[PDB]
Ligand binder design. Structure first.
Ligand SMILES: CCCCCCCCCCCCCCCCCC(=O)OC[C@H](COP(=O)(O)OCCN)OC(=O)CCCCCCCCCCCCCCCCC
Ligand SMILES: CCCCCCCCCCCCCCCCCC(=O)OC[C@H](COP(=O)(O)OCCN)OC(=O)CCCCCCCCCCCCCCCCC
Ligand SMILES: CCCCCCCCCCCCCCCCCC(=O)OC[C@H](COP(=O)(O)OCCN)OC(=O)CCCCCCCCCCCCCCCCC
Ligand SMILES: NC(=O)C1=CN([C@@H]2O[C@H](COP(=O)(O)OP(=O)(O)OC[C@H]3O[C@@H](n4cnc5c(N)ncnc54)[C@H](OP(=O)(O)O)[C@@H]3O)[C@@H](O)[C@H]2O)C=CC1
Ligand code: SF4
Ligand code: SF4
Ligand SMILES: [Zn+2]
Lengths: 118, 134, 77, 185, 425, 353, 122
């Protein structure tokens, strides 16, 4: 029921679904109920998965890093992240990337990373 | 309920054209200082010598004025939920590239009305029949 | 065409200007509904007059929980 | 009727007084009757109110007061980075007194714990704030908005798209309301 | 050996009829002749479609000309199955169901359920919570009496006091919205205390309203108390004697109007009512006029209590300090392991309440409100039964109205503080 | 009759049979559902959990249809019969399309040919473009393209157009239907005077509108009704006079017809239709229609084929006209001697009041 | 009687002879009222069809051999009778009692195994 890009794109900043059980917008907004409708007027929030991966890697020398979202009481419960593996460590609440400085040369060697590194 | 001295004074401060226009939408003779303008073009005013809860008011940009036309942060200000107008509100300055750029009014009774739908895939998948050849 | 819109505007202005609800005040929503006739909001200033019988009324406001035992009465009015 | 023990002092009323024993003169008694003195006094009260300022505000040009705690239209919020705050804990779905929330979740493509379905039936919701109280990440909140009456009932079945769009539009109010009341939460 | 003993019907069980004693006759004070002609009564349905005094009320009356023969109220038009739903909820989840029973007296409704659950929890709530709940109790009593007295006045023709007093309702509804985020259904009083503390500028704003409320009461009394039309509409109407009021299950003003000095706040003190001073208005003629005067004086004693609560408000927490019952502060929940677990469990499982049962009653604005809760030891109540004063009062409508004029029925419907969310539940 | 329906084009419909919340699987468009008969087909589909597309012209007219179905089941579409985009936006998702669009009088905007012939032709062409499975076209009794009567004639060509564009068209020929909100029983029972230029001598076999609506539903379920034609009529023949006898027999009022002669009434009927803005029940082609007599085609499927047995109109007059019989105390028949004697057991005035 | 029109005080039956009289008394009142019931709720059925339903309702409980259970059924019958003869029931309530007026029919269960199986458990 949708020709325009608002009716096909999963989000303005991402064409594709980001979970296996996610219904593609093209099939979700199809059928009789979407016939005489403005599609740009429909709610289409930006995909959070694309936005969090623009966040640069917060480098640290310490092995363990605390993350609470940065709002103090306005964030998430404080958790502690281990950066000892040679990879980008990510907060399981807010998705923020963290990496140890010991792994900077190997991470810079990597062809493509999950996070910009800069 | 304006009273003579109030209405006569506001008339002098605003002029008869403005007076009659104000009488065409709000039905009162109000005058105050311009606090600011929102994204949709609504103008917001304050006067602390008015009656309680009448010290803040909006002049709507659109003839068919609707209460949902008010920009979010201004909605808090006019409803006395905050005292700092959005013109001085730091939380209005955080850059959110995902934030809606044009104002979002209520879209009911139009063809932009929100249509709900299932956001998930079917729970069960049937076999795709493959007749084996003889 | 313009004439028929003028009558359209005129007849619609009358429907908006005298908006007479028949408040079926079933429960606690009727308390908020009753606060629309009070001085702070004064629905009468806009032309809204609450009416007791459906015969005199243009709008039904169902303000409350509709039980099965009460539904036949609501359909009747 | 009376509590146990001796009768309360002077509980028994004195005997009724006859017409003869009334301590009020005839002229006053006849005057109030024929002149309706207490009705005139009540009318005079109305004139006093007639010259007092009315309490009416001109809605929608003016609005009544609401607090940072005010419970209105639901919204889903983000972090400053734009990542969803919601991690599919299901605390709001479990506490909901009206069973208005339905949630489904799996690992996202990046392996993050996120929702795939987040619906709120606004025709089941009793606007109590329990979800907002139960959320450990401030993901579900009630906005101050109350002016969203709809033409059809289907427009009040909010899915995740509708709720995340609401959070994007209302975020500066949502942060201001959280900013003012978080010390008390 | 029941019920197989009833399979063949042996040993009928004794009824009240089998214990009727003949009165002592010594001291017992109690042809085509037209006197034998019967009189046909006409049975008129009043409500809910045809306008009535207020609410979902189908009142079926048998009339003899202008006089009431039989009064038969049909209720259940607002029966929503609240008592059954509470068995599928946690104690937290059942609390908002109490806002919606007497839905102009929300905080005292949730007060009675909190006190009953606190009793089975075996916890003493902090002193500041006690004073906040007593303070909001009398604010809610004024809100109720403003609705009850004035809408009762509006039913008999007195339009103006209803307009004046509902601006007072608007001012006190702001206090409800400042503490919770709701005009009506605050869900504010919970077992353990109150949801959150009051904002730091509320007490002074309540105080400012308190300095002017006496004048509002007085101006209401200027239109009604001495008015001869008001008196002639209320005096000698809806009389019930002190003895029958007790036997009919009448509580509150419906009981005190008949001369019985009885207030649950005095007889069985709860929250901070033992720490405050107030008087109990009591009538002597048991009629609509006495009950109107008791309610007007209750306005002044409520304001008198609120002023004492403003000055006696102590410092400290507003929620019992055990995170196994009350939710931890959000900063604690995001900071330490123990608090986060207790937050998770209270909002998914709920707190477990020790097994047992209790009947807990308070002096609600409409009379004795009680709740009977049975706990099975789990996080869901086994049984929640609500005792609504309006249920007992409306059950007495036939007793107080039989033999009287149809033109007095609106007076006694209004003299009973009748909200049908209370009656039907 | 089962949890599986396979449509003309093969779609398997796994259906959960039940009530409002159940899964009927069919998507239907019903053109002209805002009239007398459209409420019984829309109601039957929606309450089985089928999706019903309702194209409408006046918003306030279609408001009652939404109550039939669960949320999301009754869908409204703004449409004009001369807006092709609107017709085929209402049809491209449907597996069955009902055409109930008809009008007994011409209007300033629509001739009988414009609403029937051109009306069907745009709809039927939309049906074939999107390969709708079943296109049920509703028509009239006496539908014949060689008739002088434009009503019958324009119902004739539209049959031929529909069957040409879409050979599997199912044609339904109902006789004049009675029932709630009908124009047979209430028209006789309500209007003070009728201008009938034939002494109510036209005969026909009235059929309940409920049974026609039920029949329309039964054709959806059996694929054997495609390419067929259905004359749908009641058991016994009546005439407008004999039915008026029943009406008068039930409401205790005497019918009065002016009965102006045909050469004078017919031009007047034209004038009234061109100056009054509503259905006056009177027009030129309607005066001509009253001389015609319903002739039932013998080579057309009946209710038999659908497993139905129409009821006689005299079984329904009392039910449908009961609220129109006066019930004032002034109108009861005289009291029996049994009644006269019992009155003397009561006082009939309150002397103390 | 005294409380409202058709109010019957709740009493146990003394013996099986007592119970049988009440059951016959209850049936007699029911089938006698059938003409009034038709015109009072405008039922679209003849009094014959209504009176058959009365007998079947009494025949579902013909085989009861327990006195206490009879007292329960008698109390239910009086309560239903009162709320019918008083116009407390609405046409929707009485019409729902006639199983023919459900749009899925009265034979709401499969006739045999194979009809229910072919349709999918009925
Ligand atoms: C109708 C229009 C209104 C007519 C009534 C208004 C005029 C009322 C005049 C005052 C009535 C009583 C006059 C009087 O002399 O009262 C004295 C006597 C009892 O004396 P008392 O006041 O009780 O002693 C003090 C105890 N505290 O009380 C008595 O013994 C009663 C004596 C009554 C004499 C009345 C004479 C005046 C009649 C005025 C007619 C007006 C005609 C024009 C209109
Ligand atoms: C324009 C200029 C100003 C106009 C002023 C209008 C004032 C408002 C008028 C509103 C309508 C009048 C209200 C009257 C109320 C009423 O009817 O009260 C009934 C009252 C009952 O008294 P009664 O039955 O005699 O027995 C008394 C013992 N309990 O009986 C009475 O109270 C009667 C007493 C009033 C008599 C007034 C007539 C006499 C006038 C002076 C002579
Ligand atoms: C202020 C003055 C405003 C004047 C506006 C004039 C608008 C009327 C235009 C009349 C017209 O063009 O149509 C003719 C109309 C016939 O009505 P029609 O819709 O063709 O038939 C339906 C059922 N007979 O005939 C009419 O309905 C005319 C009714 C009187 C005007
Ligand atoms: N009723 C009877 O006894 C008989 C009826 N028929 C046929 O049965 C079918 C249904 O009958 P019934 O329901 O009683 O008829 P109604 O007159 O009650 O309804 C006819 C429908 O056609 C629609 N319609 C008419 N003209 C137009 C137009 N120009 N453009 C768009 N829509 C239009 C109407 O919509 P709107 O409400 O907006 O005008 C309405 O929904 C029709 O095809 C009719 O001709 C034939 C024989 C007998
Ligand atoms: S909104 Fe909050 S409480 Fe609900 S699932 Fe998301 S994170 Fe958990
Ligand atoms: S506000 Fe209350 S009822 Fe509504 S979704 Fe949140 S928890 Fe559920
Ligand atoms: Zn984090």
């Amino acid at each position: 029921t949708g020709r325009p890009a608002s009716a096909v794109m999963q989000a303005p900043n991402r064409a594709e679904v980001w979970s296996r059980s996610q219904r593609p917008r093209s099939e979700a907004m199809a059928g009789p109920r979407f016939e005489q409708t403005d599609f740009d007027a429909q709610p289409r929030p930006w995909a959070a998965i694309e936005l969090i991966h623009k966040q640069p890697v917060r480098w640290t020398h310490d092995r363990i890093v605390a993350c609470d979202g940065g709002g103090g009481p306005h964030g998430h419960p404080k958790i502690y992240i281990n950066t000892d593996k040679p990879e980008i460590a990510t907060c399981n609440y807010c998705g923020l990337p963290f990496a140890n400085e010991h792994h900077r040369k190997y991470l810079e060697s990597l062809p493509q990373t999950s996070y910009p590194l800069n | 309920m304006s009273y003579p001295t109030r209405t006569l004074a506001n008339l002098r401060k605003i002029g008869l054209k403005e007076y009659f226009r104000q009488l065409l939408y709000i039905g009162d003779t109000k005058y105050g200082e311009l606090v600011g303008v929102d994204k949709f073009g609504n103008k917001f005013y304050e006067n602390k010598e008015e009656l309680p809860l009448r010290t803040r008011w909006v002049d709507y940009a659109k003839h068919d004025y609707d209460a949902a036309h008010i920009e979010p942060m201004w909605h808090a200000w006019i409803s006395y939920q905050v005292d700092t107008p959005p013109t001085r509100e730091p939380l209005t300055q955080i850059e959110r590239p995902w934030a809606p750029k044009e104002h979002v009014p209520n879209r009911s009774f139009t063809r932009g009305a929100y249509k709900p739908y299932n956001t998930t895939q079917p729970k069960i998948q049937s076999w795709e029949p493959k007749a084996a050849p003889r | 065409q313009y004439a028929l819109t003028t009558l359209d505007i005129i007849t619609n202005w009358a429907r908006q200007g005298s908006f007479w609800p028949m408040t079926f005040g079933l429960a606690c929503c009727a308390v908020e509904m009753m606060h629309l006739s009070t001085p702070r909001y004064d629905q009468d200033r806009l032309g809204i007059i609450f009416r007791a019988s459906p015969r005199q009324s243009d709008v039904m406001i169902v303000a409350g929980t509709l039980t099965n035992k009460m539904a036949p009465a609501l359909r009747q009015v | 009727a009376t509590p146990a023990g001796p009768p309360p002092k002077n509980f028994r009323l004195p005997p009724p007084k006859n017409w003869d024993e009334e301590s009020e003169s005839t002229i006053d008694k006849v005057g109030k009757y024929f002149l309706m003195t207490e009705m005139l006094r009540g009318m005079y009260v109305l004139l006093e109110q007639f010259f007092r300022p009315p309490y009416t505000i001109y809605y929608p040009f003016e609005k009544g007061p609401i607090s940072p705690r005010f419970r209105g239209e639901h919204a889903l919020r983000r972090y400053p980075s734009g990542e969803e705050r919601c991690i599919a804990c299901k605390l709001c779905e479990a506490v909901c007194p009206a069973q208005a929330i339905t949630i489904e979740a799996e690992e996202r493509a990046d392996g993050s714990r996120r929702t795939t379905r987040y619906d709120i039936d606004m025709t089941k919701c009793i606007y109590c704030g329990f979800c907002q109280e139960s959320c450990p990440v401030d993901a579900i909140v009630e906005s101050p908005n109350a002016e969203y009456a709809t033409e059809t009932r289907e427009e009040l079945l909010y899915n995740k798209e509708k709720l995340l769009a609401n959070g994007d539009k209302w975020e500066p109010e949502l942060a201001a309301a959280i900013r003012a009341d978080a010390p008390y939460r | 050996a029941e019920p197989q003993d009833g399979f063949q019907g042996t040993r009928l069980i004794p009824t009240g009829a089998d214990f009727q004693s003949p009165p002592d006759p010594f001291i017992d004070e109690g042809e085509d002749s037209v006197e034998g002609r019967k009189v046909r009564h006409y049975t008129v349905n009043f409500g809910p479609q045809h306008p009535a005094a207020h609410g979902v009320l189908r009142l079926i009356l048998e009339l003899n000309g202008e006089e009431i023969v039989r009064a038969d109220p049909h209720v259940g038009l607002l029966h929503r199955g609240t008592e059954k739903l509470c068995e599928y909820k946690t104690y937290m989840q059942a609390l908002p169901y109490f806002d919606r029973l007497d839905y102009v007296s929300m905080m005292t409704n949730e007060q009675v359920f909190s006190l009953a659950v606190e009793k089975l929890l075996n916890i003493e709530i902090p002193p500041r919570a006690k004073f906040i709940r007593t303070m909001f109790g009398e604010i809610t009593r004024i809100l109720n009496h403003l609705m009850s007295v004035l809408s009762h006045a509006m039913d008999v023709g007195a339009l103006t006091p209803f307009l004046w007093g509902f601006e007072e309702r608007e001012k006190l509804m702001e206090f409800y919205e400042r503490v919770s985020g709701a005009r009506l259904h605050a869900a504010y009083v919970r077992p353990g205390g109150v949801h959150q503390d009051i904002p730091v500028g509320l007490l002074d704003d309540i105080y400012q309203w308190a300095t002017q409320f006496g004048d509002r009461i007085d101006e209401t009394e200027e239109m009604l108390t001495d008015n001869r039309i008001w008196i002639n509409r209320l005096k000698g109407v809806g009389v019930v004697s002190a003895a029958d009021a007790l036997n009919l299950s009448f509580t509150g003003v419906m009981l005190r109007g008949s001369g019985v000095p009885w207030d649950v706040r005095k007889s069985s003190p709860y929250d901070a009512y033992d720490q405050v001073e107030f008087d109990v208005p009591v009538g002597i003629n048991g009629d609509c006029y006495d009950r109107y005067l008791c309610r007007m004086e209750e306005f002044r004693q409520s304001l008198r209590i609120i002023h004492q609560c403003l000055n006696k408000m102590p410092a400290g927490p507003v929620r019992y300090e055990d995170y196994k019952i009350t939710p931890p502060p959000r900063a604690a929940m995001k900071e330490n392991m123990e608090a986060l677990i207790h937050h998770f469990l209270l909002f998914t499982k709920g707190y477990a309440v020790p097994p047992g049962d209790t009947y807990t009653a308070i002096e609600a604005p409409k009379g004795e409100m009680g709740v009977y809760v049975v706990s099975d030891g789990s996080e869901r109540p086994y049984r929640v039964h609500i005792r609504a004063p309006g249920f007992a009062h409306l059950s007495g409508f036939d007793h107080i109205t039989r033999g009287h004029l149809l033109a007095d029925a609106v007076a006694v419907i209004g003299t009973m503080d009748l909200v049908f969310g209370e009656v039907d539940r | 009759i089962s949890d599986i329906h396979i449509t003309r084009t093969g779609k398997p419909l796994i259906r959960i049979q039940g009530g409002r919340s159940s899964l009927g699987e069919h998507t239907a468009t019903v053109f002209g559902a805002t009239g007398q008969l459209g409420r019984y087909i829309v109601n039957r589909l929606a309450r089985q959990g089928c999706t019903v597309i309702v194209p409408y012209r006046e918003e306030m007219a279609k408001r009652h249809l939404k109550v039939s179905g669960d949320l999301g089941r009754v869908i409204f579409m703004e449409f004009d019969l001369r807006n092709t985009q609107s017709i085929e936006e209402s049809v491209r998702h449907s597996d069955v399309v009902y055409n109930l669009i008809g009008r007994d009088y011409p209007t300033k905007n629509f001739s009988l040919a414009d609403v029937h012939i051109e009306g069907t032709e745009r709809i039927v062409e939309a049906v074939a473009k999107y390969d709708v499975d079943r296109f049920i076209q509703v028509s009239t009794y006496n539908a014949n393209p060689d008739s002088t009567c434009e009503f019958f004639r324009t119902k004739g060509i539209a049959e031929k157009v529909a069957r040409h564009v879409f050979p599997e068209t199912t044609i339904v020929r109902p006789a004049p239907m009675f029932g709630f909100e009908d124009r047979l029983l209430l028209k006789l029972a309500s209007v003070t005077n009728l201008f009938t230029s034939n002494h109510m001598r036209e005969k026909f076999w009235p059929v309940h509108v409920n049974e026609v609506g039920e029949a329309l539903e039964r054709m959806l379920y059996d694929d054997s009704t495609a390419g067929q034609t259905f004359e749908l009529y009641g058991p016994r023949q009546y005439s407008m006079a004999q039915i008026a006898e029943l009406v008068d027999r039930e409401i205790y009022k005497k019918r009065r017809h002016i009965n102006l002669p045909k050469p004078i009434l017919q031009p007047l009927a034209e004038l009234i239709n061109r100056v009054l803005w509503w259905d006056t029940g009177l027009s030129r082609d309607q005066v001509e229609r009253e001389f015609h007599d319903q002739v039932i085609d013998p080579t057309a499927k009946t209710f038999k084929d659908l497993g139905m047995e129409p009821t006689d109109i005299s079984k329904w007059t009392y039910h449908y006209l009961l609220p129109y019989r006066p019930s004032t105390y002034y109108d009861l028949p005289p009291s029996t001697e049994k009644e006269m004697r019992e009155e003397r057991k009561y006082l009939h005035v309150l002397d103390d009041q | 009687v005294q409380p409202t029109k058709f109010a019957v005080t709740v009493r146990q039956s003394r013996n099986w002879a007592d119970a049988k009289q009440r059951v016959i008394a209850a049936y007699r009142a029911w089938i006698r009222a059938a003409p009034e019931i038709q015109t009072m709720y405008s039922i679209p059925f003849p009094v014959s069809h209504i009176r058959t339903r009365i007998r079947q309702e009494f025949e579902r409980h013909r085989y009861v051999n327990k006195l206490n259970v009879v007292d329960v059924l008698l109390q239910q019958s009086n309560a239903d009778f009162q709320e019918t003869m008083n116009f407390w029931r609405q046409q929707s309530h009485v019409m729902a009692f006639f199983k023919e007026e459900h749009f899925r029919g009265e034979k709401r269960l499969p006739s045999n195994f194979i009809t229910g199986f072919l349709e999918g458990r009925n």
